[PDB]
Amino acid sequence: GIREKIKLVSSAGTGHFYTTTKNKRTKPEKLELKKFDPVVRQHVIYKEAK
Amino acid sequence: KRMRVIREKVDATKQYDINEAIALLKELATAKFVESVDVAVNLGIDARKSDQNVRGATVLPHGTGRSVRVAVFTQGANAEAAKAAGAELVGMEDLADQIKKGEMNFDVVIASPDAMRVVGQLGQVLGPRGLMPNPKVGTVTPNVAEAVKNAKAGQVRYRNDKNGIIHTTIGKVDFDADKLKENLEALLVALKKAKPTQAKGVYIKKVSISTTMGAGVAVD
Amino acid sequence: MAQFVYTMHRVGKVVPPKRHILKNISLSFFPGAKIGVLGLNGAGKSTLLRIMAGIDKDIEGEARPQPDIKIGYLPQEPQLNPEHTVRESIEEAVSEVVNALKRLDEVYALYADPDADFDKLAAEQGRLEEIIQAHDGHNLNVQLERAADALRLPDWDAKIANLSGGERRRVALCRLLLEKPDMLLLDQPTNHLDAESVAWLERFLHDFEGTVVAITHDRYFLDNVAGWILELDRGEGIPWEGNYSSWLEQKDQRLAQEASQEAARRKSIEKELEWVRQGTKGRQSKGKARLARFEELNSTEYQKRNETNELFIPPGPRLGDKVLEVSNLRKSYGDRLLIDSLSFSIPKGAIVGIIGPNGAGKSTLFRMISGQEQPDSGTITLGETVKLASVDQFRDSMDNSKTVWEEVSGGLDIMKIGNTEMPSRAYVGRFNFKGVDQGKRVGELSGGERGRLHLAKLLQVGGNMLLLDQPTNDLDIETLRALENALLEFPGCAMVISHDRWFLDRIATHILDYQDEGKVEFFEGNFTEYEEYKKRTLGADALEPKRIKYKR
RNA sequence: UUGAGCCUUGAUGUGUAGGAUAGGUGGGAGGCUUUGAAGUGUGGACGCCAGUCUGCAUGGAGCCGACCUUGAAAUACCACC
Ligand SMILES: Nc1ncnc2c1ncn2[C@@H]1O[C@H](COP(=O)(O)OP(=O)(O)OP(=O)(O)O)[C@@H](O)[C@H]1O
Ligand SMILES: Nc1ncnc2c1ncn2[C@@H]1O[C@H](COP(=O)(O)OP(=O)(O)OP(=O)(O)O)[C@@H](O)[C@H]1O
Ligand code: NA
Ligand code: NA
Incomplete structure (x- = not known):
């Protein structure tokens, strides 16, 4: 096991985040995708967090 | 010599009453001079932060007793308004480089809310001694009638030093000690009103009173 | 009592x-304290500096500065603008005062205008009447004319x-310093500076208070200023009070004791393994508790990450x-002459050390030798048997988005050095880049x-x-000595530029000393023989320092 | 015997160019100098090494301010220093 849990914090300022596993060794670059934010009800960009 | 001898008279350890300090200081009337007053207010405030510096101007009630030339720079017929009101010097907007080209011994700031022609070199030609005026002090306005009397009154600025230590002229010994105490109260209230946006502890850490050739005494 | 500028409490990092x-690095700092951080390449010194300056908060534990202290952080490789000039790069540092002067002149323009004369001023100018005073925006001109x-x-x-x-680092140092800060955190501040600088x-550092945490591999630099030494060996923080000479013996003692304890633990593990592998002897115990103790004894310890050894140089x-003679060489940039009428001839099998001030043409010489430039006079005459291999003065030519192995080899399982090929993985491993440390991106490297x-x-x-251009850039003592011993065995010719x-002193056989007016003089021998030459034809002149200072 | 703190007494602060070791505001102004000079040996810490502070030698009545050629000016109290 080398994949460790990360959470994709939102970018609308609300408190909402997904969680996933990311190989921090071979992918030092941070993730950012477009995911659904059910608080504001819109497809916003989710940035990488702790 | 005499300063070392009167070191016995001075009691710098003990802080002293507002009027007891003047009682001590007036016994030094043996100096061969006018013996002016050289108060030093010592506030508690950190000078490095910009917001914690104060530079105002207040009109002392009983005056200073010493006068200097007042120079007013007007863009147009502004430099002649004091010529009919007692202004020491009038400078024209077309005479910005010739306002004090020969002599600069004119300790009066320039107030002209309409003529903004002459300022001076931007590089301590009129910015090192404070020749650049602004309405924050109080002189920035197009009404010179008030400033004509304010120059004779001697509205003293609050020159904030490297650690909040300010001096002024407070009605030299020839003025009565009651007038001196009135000046003290009027300056203390003014600076208390002047207190900056951030303050801690006690604002006024100390006050000392002295003479150009006369030793210093606490004020409390 | 009191004091206590900065604190770190159980500050882990993974x-x-x-x-x-x-x-578990828990320690505190005090006003007017100088700390020198030691360690090896990979010990975490630069990460600790970044944490202490507060760049990264991905720690476990706490890292607090006392409020109202200014922190000046000098990183490993400061990044500037390749478009800017020195004037517009330094002018950025004193930013609150250039805009203060500009806005004050603009308000001097707009104040005589009768439009909102008592609204556009009392709210806006008043916020600047002290930004021009506390920072003293009026006299920045003389401040810069002095600090230059x-x-x-x-x-x-x-x-x-x-x-x-070197001038780039000088500019960066001025930019960092001008803020007049208290905490001064520097990571190898003297990478390119000469003796004078x-x-x-x-x-200046020894005079200046406010606590200075400095990364340095230089014993002589550290000795003058450091009052404390942080070791930072293998995830532990060892504080030592003294000088470098006293601390080195303690470090050696610690390594010797750790090796002895390692050997003792090994022997114990053998002895217990024999009992584990023995028989049973009837219907008796065999000691499940003893088995659990032996299983617990099988722990792990970190070998020193890079005790790097002699490097590899393929001739x-x-x-x-003919070793590329040079005749009547003259160089200039506009009117600034770097070298005039230079002529010499390197012998065969020699090492030539180049010494001189900053920006005196040392890199320019390699530039014109490698064909990048042209000589304004004379000619450099290469030997036809000469193979050229010149090391760039700057690390900033790799691509940070590539792995170590890919970057070095070129994505080939077998590359070639010289004429024989040998595998790329082995070629890199000869530089103490083991298989595990192979996988780090070159952007993630100390x-x-x-x-x-x-x-x-x-x-x-x-x-x-x-043509080595300062290979001793960020090299530790052992890393430096590995190359220092490998170079003495080189068959070919080696020209080395260093400060x-x-x-x-250990490798140079010929000397190129730079001087004033663009004077470059050749010499044959080592530095002790150079000193012998000076003493034989001497001159009485030792008045180097004057201590200009910064503030009036 | 000593560590540390506090309060008072002293001393120290040499970028360039005005004059030559000058930290900040002074408050404004010639007063200091005579409990005995600018001057004549040197006491000694330090120095960036030109010297400026200072023990003692007779007499013992002297310097600058102001002008400013540089951003700033004149050690000629006292202030948190
Ligand atoms: N993504 C990563 N994967 C693997 N190792 C990493 C990664 N990021 C950093 N490291 C390692 O962490 C360590 C960071 O060390 P640091 O940057 O403090 O330099 P140093 O060698 O301690 O000091 P200096 O280079 O200043 O002499 C290095 O050993 C580096 O290889
Ligand atoms: N293209 C250029 N235009 C103008 N000046 C240049 C140019 N290239 C170099 N110089 C100048 O030539 C001088 C020598 O530069 P060079 O690269 O040789 O430095 P160096 O002596 O090796 O210094 P360092 O100690 O930084 O390694 C410097 O004054 C530099 O400013
Ligand atoms: Na580093
Ligand atoms: Na160079």
Whole structure:
């Protein structure tokens, strides 16, 4: 096991985040995708967090 | 010599009453001079932060007793308004480089809310001694009638030093000690009103009173 | 009592592999304290500096500065603008005062205008009447005219592209300093400075209070200023009070004791393994508790991450008598003459150390030798047997988005050094880049590791006229001595440019000393023989320092 | 015997160019100098090494301010220093 849990914090300022596993060794670059934010009800960009 | 001898008279350890300090200081009337007053207010405030510096101007009630030339720079017929009101010097907007080209011994700031022609070199030609005026002090306005009397009154600025230590002229010994105490109260209230946006502890850490050739005494 | 500027409490740090470069470092700092941080390339010194300056908060534990202290952080490789000039780069540092003057002149324009004269002023100018006072925006001109003298900055018209390596660090130092800060955190502040600048900086640092945490591999630099030493060996923080000479013996003692304890633990593990493997002897116990104790005894310990050893240098084509002579060389940039009427001839099988001030043409010489430039007079005459291999002065030529192995080899399972091929993995492993440490991206590399990798990548041409431009950039003591012993065995010719004369004292056989007016003089021998020459034809002149200072 | 703190007494602060070791505001102004000079040996710490502070030698009545050629000016109290 080398994949460790990360959470994709939102970018609308609300408190909402997904969680996933990311190989921090071979992918030092941070993730950012477009995911659904059910608080504001819109497809916003989710940035990488702790 | 005499300063070392009167070191016995001075009691710098003990802080002293507002009027007891003047009682001590007036016994030094043996100096061969006018013996002016050289108060030093010592506030508690950190000078490095910009917001914690104060530079105002207040009109002392009983005056200073010493006068200097007042120079007013007007863009147009502004430099002649004091010529009919007692202004020491009038400078024209077309005479910005010739306002004090020969002599600069004119300790009066320039107030002209309409003529903004002459300022001076931007590089301590009129910015090192404070020749650049602004309405924050109080002189920035197009009404010179008030400033004509304010120059004779001697509205003293609050020159904030490297650690909040300010001096002024407070009605030299020839003025009565009651007038001196009135000046003290009027300056203390003014600076208390002047207190900056951030303050801690006690604002006024100390006050000392002295003479150009006369030793210093606490004020409390 | 009182004091206590900065604190760290149980400040761990975990890297993607798994190890903890920092774990359980709890310590505090005091006003007017100088700390020198030691360690090896990979110990975590630069990460600790970043944490202490507060760049990264991905720690476990706490890291607090006392409020109202200004922190000046000098990183490993400061990044500037290749478009800017020295004037517009330094002018950025004092930013609240340039805008203060500009806005004050604009308000001097707008105040006589009768439009909102009592609204546009009392709210806006008042916020500046003290920004021009506390920071003193009026006298920045004389402040800069004085502060330029001490560092002896390049000319104002100079461009960053035209700027040389040492002058770039000088400019960055001025920019960082001008804030007048209390905490001064520097990571290898003297990478490119010469004797004059280094002595000046290590006098100013000792004078300047507010606590200074400095990363340094230089014993002599550290000794003058450091009052405390932080070790930072293998995820532990060892504080030592003394000097470098006293601390080195304690470090050696610690290593010896750890090795002895390692051997004792090994022997115990053998002895218990024999009992574990013995029989049963009837219907008796065999001691499940003893088994559990033995199983617990099988722990792990970290070998010192890089006790790097002698590097690899593959020699190439045989070289004859002609070693690229130079005749009547003259160089200039506009009117600024660097070298005039230079003529010499390197012998065969020699090492030539080049010494001189900053921006005196040392890199320019390699530039014109490698064909990048042209000589304004004379000619350099290469030998036809000569193979060229010149190391760039700057690490900033790799691509940070590539792995170590890919960057060095080129994505080939077998590459070639010189003429014989040998596998790329082995070629990199010869530079102490083990299989595990193979996988880190070259953007995720310490200064010393980056230097080692860049050297390894460039030295694969298999040439024999090695033009090294400061290989001693970010090298530890052992890393330096590995290359220092490998170079003495080089068959081909080696031309080396450096500022630390102690490295050259062991390897240099010919000397190129720069001087004023653009005077470059050749010499045959080592530095002790150079001193002998000076003493035989001497001159009484020792009045080097003047201590210009910064503030009036 | 000593660590540390506090309060008072002293001393120290040499970028360039005005004059030559000058930290900040002074408050404004010639007063200091005579409990005995600018001057004549040197006491000694330090120095960037030109010297400026200072023990003692007779007499013992002297310097600058102001002008400013540089951003700033004149050690000629006292202030948190
Ligand atoms: N993503 C990563 N994967 C693996 N190792 C990493 C990663 N990021 C950093 N590291 C390692 O963490 C360590 C960081 O060390 P740091 O940057 O403090 O330099 P140093 O060698 O301690 O000091 P200096 O280079 O200044 O002499 C290095 O050993 C580096 O290889
Ligand atoms: N293209 C250029 N235009 C103008 N000046 C230049 C140019 N290239 C170099 N210079 C100048 O030539 C001088 C020598 O630069 P060089 O690169 O040789 O430095 P160096 O002596 O090796 O210094 P360092 O100690 O930084 O390594 C410097 O004054 C630099 O500003
Ligand atoms: Na580093
Ligand atoms: Na160079």
